[PDB]
Design an enzyme around this catalytic site. Structure first.
Site, short mmCIF file in Angstrom:
data_model
loop_
_atom_site.label_atom_id
_atom_site.label_comp_id
_atom_site.label_asym_id
_atom_site.label_seq_id
_atom_site.Cartn_x
_atom_site.Cartn_y
_atom_site.Cartn_z
N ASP B 92 6.20 5.12 4.27
CA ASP B 92 5.80 5.74 3.02
C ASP B 92 6.44 7.11 2.92
O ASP B 92 7.09 7.56 3.87
CB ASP B 92 4.29 5.80 2.95
N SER B 93 6.30 7.80 1.77
CA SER B 93 7.19 8.94 1.56
C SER B 93 6.49 10.20 2.08
O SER B 93 7.10 11.28 2.24
CB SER B 93 7.42 9.08 0.06
N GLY B 94 5.18 10.09 2.35
CA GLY B 94 4.45 11.22 2.94
C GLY B 94 3.62 11.95 1.91
O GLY B 94 2.68 12.70 2.24
N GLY B 95 3.92 11.71 0.64
CA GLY B 95 3.29 12.51 -0.40
C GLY B 95 1.79 12.31 -0.52
O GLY B 95 1.04 13.28 -0.72
N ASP B 141 6.94 10.77 -4.56
CA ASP B 141 6.31 10.96 -5.84
C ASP B 141 5.22 12.02 -5.79
O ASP B 141 4.90 12.56 -4.72
CB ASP B 141 5.72 9.61 -6.31
N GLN B 188 4.14 5.28 -11.92
CA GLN B 188 2.90 6.07 -12.09
C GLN B 188 2.45 5.94 -13.50
O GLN B 188 2.91 5.07 -14.24
CB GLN B 188 3.13 7.54 -11.73
N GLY B 215 -0.71 4.95 -7.61
CA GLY B 215 -1.83 5.56 -8.35
C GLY B 215 -3.07 4.71 -8.53
O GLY B 215 -3.96 5.06 -9.33
N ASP B 265 -0.34 -3.10 1.88
CA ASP B 265 -0.59 -2.53 3.20
C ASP B 265 -1.99 -2.01 3.08
O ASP B 265 -2.40 -1.51 2.00
CB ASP B 265 0.35 -1.35 3.48
N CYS B 303 -10.83 -19.41 12.43
CA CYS B 303 -9.71 -18.57 12.79
C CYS B 303 -8.93 -19.09 14.01
O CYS B 303 -9.52 -19.48 15.03
CB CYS B 303 -10.19 -17.12 13.02
N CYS B 308 -10.46 -15.44 18.86
CA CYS B 308 -11.47 -16.45 18.51
C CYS B 308 -11.34 -17.67 19.42
O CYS B 308 -12.28 -18.44 19.54
CB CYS B 308 -11.39 -16.82 17.02
N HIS B 334 -8.09 -9.68 15.88
CA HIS B 334 -8.67 -10.66 15.00
C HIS B 334 -8.50 -10.31 13.51
O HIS B 334 -8.13 -11.17 12.68
CB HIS B 334 -10.17 -10.82 15.28
#
Ligand SMILES: Nc1nc2[nH]cnc2c(=O)[nH]1
Ligand SMILES: Nc1nc2[nH]cnc2c(=O)[nH]1
Ligand SMILES: [Zn+2]
Ligand SMILES: [Zn+2]
EC number: 2.4.2.29
Lengths: 368, 368
Positions: B92-95, B141, B188, B215, B265, B303, B308, B334
């Protein structure tokens, strides 16, 4: 496999190497037992513990009886099934950790988690270890503090011998346990040769599957510990395993094997791992030290473990400084693997009649 | 393999399934990306992450730039080599995490670990993601808070579009990065359809390898989120991947895929795991609850994960209540496996033209 069979394959001076065969598997000796506190070897799956070379682990009775409870573990199928480790487990008797109202019957104490009150006695300790399904059961003893006067050391050793007979009778009273598990007795007597001898004589008269040297994990310093082992181990029956409880550092282990010890447990590789200490053949390092922040080498450049095959000191440094779980996982795996590799080197060198040389070489490098 | 190729194999309404091919591997879509915060997916080795079915993980720029530092990671060989994950990584860009003095140039901020001062701008964010060796780079952004007035939402979206062009030019300026990595832009505009449209138009004019809907991870509630996706996803180029950042719960994912999202994510399966929450097909459970203390069933009885196959709810209950690391390890494995199985079911059902039915069945059971 038999309930219990100890066979000595090779000797060199007082050192021995061999095997203990039990229903759940074979234990190569000298053996190091990773410690499971609360039904887990911290930060490792059992399959990972096995992959490092461990043949048996230790379970702590005191912690298990408070959480999750012995009766509950028995209801769920016993400790092996609960935690997923199907090989032998040795359980301690709980007495060291409880060390509060004491008497000849046993001890009553308050939980350090709860304030709840509990009781331990030779009979209840043996019962708990049965409910856990332990393969090697330790007799319940009274801990002697260090230092101890001769009179206190004698009183406490004598009480421990009475309790060792009670432990033996409780264990033998329970069919499933007597037929499937083994029972070890614990020698006491502090640093006093005559008391160690009376204690050895009492325990041999009662008769046990193996013999632990108790009362040494306790502040005395390595020179004194080695001095006590010098005279104490030869007092124990030669044809049964000798277990030094709560030891220890790699150099402690090597010296103790040179004095006839076959079995060890210690929390150092696990606990030290989570706190940043890694064992190497060149001595322990603390991976948090800034000198490792860009060090691309593995923790130890001879180690065969999966951690040293795959990740750098620099990465583990970052993980431990950051408080990440994977840091504890990797340091613990490496440290347990290092201990297993040390025991394998010890076993091979005794088998090959070159253990004295190995001990000398090990010390030269480890302390350089 | 090419630098970047997205192919759509099957559709059902707005939902798509397909693959993104990159130099480091193939990503099946819809995809869920476990989050590595500080160069580790918490409590898992990379091989375990891969075993659950993950094809790509996310790295957090903000945390990595503070510890251990982007330049240091580059000196040690880049993030893949550092952490031992050799497949694609999206950074990610960190923003979002920085969200302090802001301006058109970028933002300066104090480390929440150190009080040390740092700067982030479209150019420095793209540079950091290059130093980490990221395969999918996110444009930098400005975060719009929720709720936002129309004027603030417009100002911030406009700034983000200017920054998206700066991000594109910085990325394209660096040969090794432009040739080997991909760049995604972020739409955005808060909840406002006209601003979402202007933002989509600006990003398509600039041109990106994929498009994220930004956003929405931010307090609005699922109904509002779904309403915004309804009109926002169709504005993005159909032939490129659509990534919904910071979402989310299993039901969020299913609904978002029904609205044309291909990539997700979230920290829920990791974080929720360490805190006792386990995902099941019958809904989440909190394993610390006393009702599980003697429950011998696995976390979820359908599962396929190794946790499991091997350990009970009762054992994991004990581990989490006891604060043991192995508890976090097992719950996280799990939960990530459950998310991967959910994405596989989503992929198969779209491929088979029965995703609507699967979504309905999934909701019926998950909320029963
Ligand atoms: N039970 C017991 N455990 C120990 N751990 C270390 N020393 C001792 C001991 O003397 N008795
Ligand atoms: N960079 C960025 N990250 C996010 N994570 C969740 N939402 C956002 C967003 O709008 N921008
Ligand atoms: Zn190693
Ligand atoms: Zn599972």
């Amino acid at each position: 496999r038999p309930r219990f069979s100890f066979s000595i394959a090779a000797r060199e001076g007082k050192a021995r190497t061999g095997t203990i065969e039990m229903k759940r598997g074979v234990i190569r000796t000298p053996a190091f037992m990773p410690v499971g506190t609360a039904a887990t070897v911290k930060a490792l799956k059992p399959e990972t513990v096995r992959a490092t070379g461990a043949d048996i682990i230790l379970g702590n009775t005191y912690h298990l009886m408070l959480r999750p409870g012995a009766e509950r573990i028995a209801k769920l199928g016993g400790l092996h099934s609960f935690m997923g480790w199907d090989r032998p487990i040795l359980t301690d008797s709980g007495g060291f950790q409880v060390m509060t109202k004491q008497s000849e019957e046993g001890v009553t104490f308050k939980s350090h988690l709860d304030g709840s009150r509990h009781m331990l006695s030779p009979e209840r300790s043996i019962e708990i270890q049965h409910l856990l399904g332990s393969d090697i059961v330790m007799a319940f003893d009274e801990v002697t503090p260090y230092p101890a006067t001769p009179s206190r050391a004698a009183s406490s050793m004598e009480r421990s011998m009475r309790w060792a007979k009670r432990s033996r009778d409780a264990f033998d009273s329970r069919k499933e346990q007597a037929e499937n598990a083994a029972l070890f007795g614990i020698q006491q007597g502090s640093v006093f040769e005559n008391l160690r001898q009376q204690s050895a004589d009492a325990l041999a008269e009662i008769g046990f599957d193996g013999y632990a040297v108790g009362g040494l994990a306790v502040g005395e310093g390595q020179d004194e510990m080695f001095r006590v082992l010098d005279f104490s181990v030869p007092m124990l029956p030669d044809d049964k395993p000798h277990y030094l409880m709560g030891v220890g550092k790699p150099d402690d282990i090597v010296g103790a094997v040179e004095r006839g010890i076959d079995m060890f447990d210690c929390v150092l590789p696990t606990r030290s791992g989570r706190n940043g200490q890694a064992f190497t053949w060149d001595g322990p390092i603390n991976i948090r030290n800034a000198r490792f922040s860009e060090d691309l080498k593995p923790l130890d450049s001879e180690c065969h473990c999966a951690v040293c095959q795959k990740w750098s000191r620099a990465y583990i440094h970052h993980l431990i400084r950051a408080g990440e779980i994977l840091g504890a996982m990797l340091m613990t795996e490496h440290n347990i693997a290092f201990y297993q590799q040390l025991m394998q080197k010890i076993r091979d060198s005794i088998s090959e009649g070159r253990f004295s040389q190995f001990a000398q070489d090990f010390r030269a490098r480890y302390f350089a």
